[PDB]
Amino acid sequence: LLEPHCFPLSLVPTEFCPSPPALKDGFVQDEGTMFPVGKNVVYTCNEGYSLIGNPVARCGEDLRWLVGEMHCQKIACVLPVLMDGIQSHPQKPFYTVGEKVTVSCSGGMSLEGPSAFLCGSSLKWSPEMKNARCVQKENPLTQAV
Amino acid sequence: NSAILTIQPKQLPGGQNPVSYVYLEVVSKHFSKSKRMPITYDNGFLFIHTDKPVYTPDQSVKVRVYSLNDDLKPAKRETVLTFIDPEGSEVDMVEEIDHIGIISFPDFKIPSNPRYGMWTIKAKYKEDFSTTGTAYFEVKEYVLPHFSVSIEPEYNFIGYKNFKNFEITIKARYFYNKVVTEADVYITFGIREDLKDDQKEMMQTAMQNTMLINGIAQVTFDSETAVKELSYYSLEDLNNKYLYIAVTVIESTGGFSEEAEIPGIKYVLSPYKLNLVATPLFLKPGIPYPIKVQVKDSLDQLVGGVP
Amino acid sequence: QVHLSPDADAYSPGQTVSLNMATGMDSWVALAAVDSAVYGVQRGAKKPLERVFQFLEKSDLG
Amino acid sequence: YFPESWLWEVHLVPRRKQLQFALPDSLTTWEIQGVGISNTGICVADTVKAKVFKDVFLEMNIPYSVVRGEQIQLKGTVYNYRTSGMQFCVKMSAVEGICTSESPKCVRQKVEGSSSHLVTFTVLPLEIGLHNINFSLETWFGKEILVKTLRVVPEGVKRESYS
Amino acid sequence: PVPPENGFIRNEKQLYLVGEDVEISCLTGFETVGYQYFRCLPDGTWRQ
Numbered sequence: 229l230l231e232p233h234c235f236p237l238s239l240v241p242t243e244f245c246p247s248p249p250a251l252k253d254g255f256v257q258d259e260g261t262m263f264p265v266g267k268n269v270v271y272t273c274n275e276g277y278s279l280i281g282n283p284v285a286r287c288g289e290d291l292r293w294l295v296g297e298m299h300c301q302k303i304a305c306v307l308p309v310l311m312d313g314i315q316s317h318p319q320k321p322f323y324t325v326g327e328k329v330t331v332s333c334s335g336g337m338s339l340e341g342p343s344a345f346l347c348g349s350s351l352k353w354s355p356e357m358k359n360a361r362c363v364q365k366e367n368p369l370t371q372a373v
Numbered sequence: 374n375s376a377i378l379t380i381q382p383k384q385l386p387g388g389q390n391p392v393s394y395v396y397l398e399v400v401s402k403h404f405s406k407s408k409r410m411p412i413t414y415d416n417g418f419l420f421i422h423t424d425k426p427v428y429t430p431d432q433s434v435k436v437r438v439y440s441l442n443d444d445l446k447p448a449k450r451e452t453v454l455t456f457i458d459p460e461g462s463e464v465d466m467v468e469e470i471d472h473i474g475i476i477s478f479p480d481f482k483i484p485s486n487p488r489y490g491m492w493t494i495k496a497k498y499k500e501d502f503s504t505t506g507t508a509y510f511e512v513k514e515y516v517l518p519h520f521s522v523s524i525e526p527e528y529n530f531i532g533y534k535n536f537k538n539f540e541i542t543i544k545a546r547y548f549y550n551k552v553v554t555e556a557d558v559y560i561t562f563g564i565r566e567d568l569k570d571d572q573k574e575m576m577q578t579a580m581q582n583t584m585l586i587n588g589i590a591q592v593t594f595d596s597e598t599a600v601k602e603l604s605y606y607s608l609e610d611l612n613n614k615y616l617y618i619a620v621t622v623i624e625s626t627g628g629f630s631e632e633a634e635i636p637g638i639k640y641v642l643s644p645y646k647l648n649l650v651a652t653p654l655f656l657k658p659g660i661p662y663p664i665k666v667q668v669k670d671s672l673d674q675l676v677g678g679v680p
Numbered sequence: 681q682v683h684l685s686p687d688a689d690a691y692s693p694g695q696t697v698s699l700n701m702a703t704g705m706d707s708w709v710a711l712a713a714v715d716s717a718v719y720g721v722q723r724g725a726k727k728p729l730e731r732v733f734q735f736l737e738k739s740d741l742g
Numbered sequence: 743y744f745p746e747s748w749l750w751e752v753h754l755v756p757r758r759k760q761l762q763f764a765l766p767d768s769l770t771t772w773e774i775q776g777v778g779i780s781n782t783g784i785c786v787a788d789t790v791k792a793k794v795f796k797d798v799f800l801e802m803n804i805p806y807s808v809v810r811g812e813q814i815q816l817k818g819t820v821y822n823y824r825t826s827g828m829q830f831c832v833k834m835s836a837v838e839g840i841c842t843s844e845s846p847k848c849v850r851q852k853v854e855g856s857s858s859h860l861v862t863f864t865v866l867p868l869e870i871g872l873h874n875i876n877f878s879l880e881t882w883f884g885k886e887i888l889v890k891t892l893r894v895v896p897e898g899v900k901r902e903s904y905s
Numbered sequence: 906p907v908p909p910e911n912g913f914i915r916n917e918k919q920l921y922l923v924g925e926d927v928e929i930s931c932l933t934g935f936e937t938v939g940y941q942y943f944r945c946l947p948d949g950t951w952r953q
């Protein structure tokens with residue numbers, strides 16, 4: 229263990245992990261015929277995704293990968309809960325990076341807040357609001373005479 | 374051959390103190406050695422781009438940060454952004470996942486009455502990395518300028534060649550890339566003890582007006598005539614000190630009144646200080662050996678043509 | 681390499697214009713715009729990403 | 743629009759990609775800097791420069807912030823890059839957080855070709871916060887609307903205090 | 906810094922960093938009017 233090179237060596241390994249698990253919408257950034265005990269691999273999620281958590285897999289004890297917490301997220305601003313029945317018009321499954329989104333109440337109602345949000349921060353709406361009014365008192369005093 | 378290897382950033386035993394040293398080992402059939410190689414948590418790069426280099430109060434500093442391995446591939450590490458006051462205190466830490474390979478942050482709306490001055494962005498990787506690329510922005514009360522103004526002499530110093538007559542360009546251009554047609558110019562000359570700070574005064578006479586026409590004006594300070602008439606510094610032997618020149622340009626039919634300054638006119642005994650430029654200080658017999666030197670004025674620029 | 685595709689010496693208030701970003705591979709891009717007058721106020725201010733190649737050179741351990 | 747910056751965005755580009763925008767009312771060189779991030783490295787483009795530049799326009803020297811209850815001069819100008827001289831006018835209109843002598847109509851003074859002229863407006867900002875002001879050129883051929891925004895702060899000595 | 910009349914430094918160090926702070930207050934007979942911390946400015950002062 230101190231001075232290995234004084235001895236014979238089978239420097240080629242003979243104990244291995246099985247090939248790492250795949251991921252949805254991502255791949256092992258490393259490839260080979262086998263992975264020896266305690267050799268790492270790293271994951272990268274494919275085009276339009278960010279790998280959330282820890283991308284590094286160990287090949288740890290009991291020959292299992294000990295991959296740890298990891299998840300491929302597609303880099304769109306997926307819309308959070310809206311405000312007061314106020315609607316995002318250009319709806320998609322995944323709002324695309326820098327896509328200017330326009331927002332409104334049902335017609336004639338006294339809406340509040342900004343008209344738009346832009347996903348230029350590609351996982352968070354550049355401006356945002358959590359709550360705003362759709363409607364108000366739209367009928368004044370009449371016939372005061 | 375080469376391996377590509379790393380300290381895996383999570384796998385360091387870590388905790389409250391860093392591992393400051395590591396071993397690098399080879400086990401060949403024929404040899405082994407360790408060696409205590411250092412490590413640094415300064416990995417890759419952080420570069421910090423602010424939507425302006427300047428702000429006023431009631432603005433938001435809208436930083437974005439660019440995060441890259443030493444491969445210069447984007448890093449995709451969660452990151453935390455340390456806004457520092459001018460007074461050296463920390464005022465915010467805000468975090469975002471490096472999801473693109475680029476990291477926006479929430480705008481950091483200027484705190485309700487800020488300390489004016491050079492705030493700073495110590496962009497810190499969260500988790501293992503210390504890299505702390507750092508960048509700067511200044512809170513100032515301002516309106517944007519109408520035109521650029523710039524000042525250009527050949528020497529940036531007063532001394533033996535020119536103390537009787539020091540000679541300098543005042544020039545101005547609109548930010549739509551056209552020369553300022555006509556401007557009235559005042560030149561202020563004041564003796565200054567250092568580039569750092571003073572409250573010294575201007576020459577009460579031998580101040581200078583000039584006219585800027587077709588984007589340009591010329592100025593000639595007879596610095597002996599001013600100094601020997603108004604000031605203590607009667608002899609050219611006396612000083613390694615400074616002249617503050619300040620230039621106010623008012624458009625002659627336009628109502629905009631820009632101003633600029635150069636503390637970088639040294640009064641100096643030995644202006645042309647030197648350095649080597651690219652010279653390794655190691656020789657080779659039988660191959661002709663270069664030397665390169667350069668020469669620096671005070672508030673340094675390269676002086677140009679000097680023997 | 682970047683260009684406004686309506687190639688002109690000058691443009692006008694409220695004018696719509698197109699920018700195109702020719703790039704030698706699949707790439708992210710990050711646009712930012714400033715009035716030159718913003719550099720006119722902070723004396724001697726570098727461009728906000730000026731000499732990125734020089735900062736990138738400070739990582740040389742030699 | 744009158745911005746100090748805008749176009750703050752990030753995109754993924756196929757080997758060409760195009761984006762379209764309205765150039766703002768700020769008549770200066772918009773200098774536009776684009777930064778490319780991909781597996782080979784970073785890049786910053788050779789900065790594109792575009793100029794918002796018209797043959798005749800107004801601009802106004804309005805300070806950054808003003809003392810509520812003090813009257814000041816705002817200094818106006820026309821630039822005329824037409825080949826010839828022409829008569830011009832100017833007018834001001836703003837929210838009631840301002841008061842003025844200028845009673846919003848000129849003597850209709852002339853600016854020469856390839857030349858600029860001076861103007862003055864006298865105002866007392868009477869309430870704080872932000873006031874939007876429109877400066878308008880009211881002239882033949884090339885004409886403009888400016889909309890310009892002015893901060894106002896209270897008349898007294900600043901003190902900070904703590905606990 | 907030497908604490909004020911009848912005063913006592915709560916957190917004690919050889920050398921406080923820039924932007925780092927110290928807390929004070931008066932001894933047992935006594936109470937502080939006003940803000941009872943001070944902070945080391947970049948020039949080496951405390952602005953007490």
Ligand SMILES: *[C@@H]1O[C@H](CO)[C@@H](O[C@@H]2O[C@H](CO)[C@@H](O[C@@H]3O[C@H](CO)[C@@H](O)[C@H](O)[C@@H]3O)[C@H](O)[C@H]2NC(C)=O)[C@H](O)[C@H]1NC(C)=O
Pocket residue numbers: 835836875876887889
């Ligand atoms: C100063 O200049 C501004 C321009 O910034 C003037 O604001 C403009 O005011 C008019 C009338 O209030 C707006 O017209 C609008 O038409 C749309 C059509 O959809 C209608 O939906 C609106 O309710 C309104 O009738 C115009 O958009 C607006 N321009 C903007 C964008 O501000 C302002 O009136 C002038 N200010 C003074 C001196 O009062």
